[model samples]
Target: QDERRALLERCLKGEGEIEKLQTKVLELQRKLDNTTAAVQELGRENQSLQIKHTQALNRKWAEDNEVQNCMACGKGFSVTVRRHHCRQCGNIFCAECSAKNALTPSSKKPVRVCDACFNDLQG
Candidate 1:
């Protein structure tokens, strides 16, 4: 009777330990999942910041050459810049340049034109 009781007690204690180990494993898994999610979120934020930084650098490069004369119109040089770059022609012109007759009458003027663009009336 004594041996039987001792064996049963040992078995029950082992079962409880097993349950505790299972609970700990689950807790660790949850922590791992949360860490992975945080890393992915940080990665996305870093990518967004890199994009914005590159854009700012490109704009700075354009500004650095502001004093340099633009080949577009010699009458008025680019002193101050207001708007962003023109997607069609990779040149950043001043607000006055954007007011070219070829551009939209109401919209911002276009002052500098590429080599292909000479006439102020045509597109």
Candidate 2:
């Protein structure tokens, strides 16, 4: 009876001091899981940002090159037929020739690319 009573008192004291220790431990594991998710999310974000930066560079390259016509279809730039740049080679193309979107290595998300760029991605 004495031993049982002392045990009960000790258990009460331990609980009173830190009643949520088990919960705290579980919360720590949950924190680890949350960190893992955050890591993966940041990785994906990095890929997206890298793709955006690459695209911006390509757009700048096309602008710098002063492309006057579609490199793929050989269509001259006009009011109706606007020029678009291939994300892969940074070359200008007509909208028709660069209409396709595909996933490229620079970005995790799909982005607009020229016919040959799209084909190269597919193969």
Candidate 3:
């Protein structure tokens, strides 16, 4: 009878430990799934941003780099859609994309700037 009782106690202890490990495993799986879903959602949000190409130029554009698209509007260049360089940021943009003006240290007068620089200068 004592041996039977010892076996029963061991089985109950093992069952409790199994339950604890099962709970821990389920919790870890849920945490991973939540993290994965959140990252995917953020990636989706980034893909739909209005400004397709976001960049901060370290220096003036190279003479060899003849840009073919408006950095702000993301539209391809054409004869009618002429290219314009933003004085403040030094990035190339189209007429409508770089319509706003901002003050520049290089020039005495305000110069045409891109949408991003205009917002930063204004605010």
Q: How many residue pairs clash in each candidate?
A: 8, 0, 0
Clashing pairs in 3: none
Clashing pairs in 2: none
Better of 2 and 3 by TM-score: 3
Name the weakest run of 10 consecutive residues (lDDT summed) in model 1: 111-120
Error of 2 at 34 (Å): 63
lDDT of 3 by residue, 1-123 (tens): 999999999999999999999999999999999999999999888875534344443557524147777888789988788778877777888888987787877678888888888887763
Task: Select the stronger candidate by TM-score from 1 and 3.
Answer: 3
Could you give me the TM-score of model 1 versus the true structure?
0.48
Against the true structure, what is each candidate's TM-score?
Answer: 0.48, 0.47, 0.51
- Show model 1 residue runs off by greater than 4 Å: 60-123
Candidate 2 residue lDDT tens string, 78-108: 7887877777778888888988888887789
Best by TM-score: 3
- Cα displacement (Å) at residue 115, model 2: 0.8
Q: Write the per-residue lDDT of candidate 1 for residues 1-123, one digit (tens) a residue.
A: 999899989999999999999999999999999999999999999999999778645642245355444435443353353443333344654445544434533348643444333342457
Task: Candidate 2: give its CA RMSD in angstroms.
Answer: 11.2
- Best-fitting candidate, measured by lDDT? 2
lDDT of each: 0.59, 0.81, 0.80
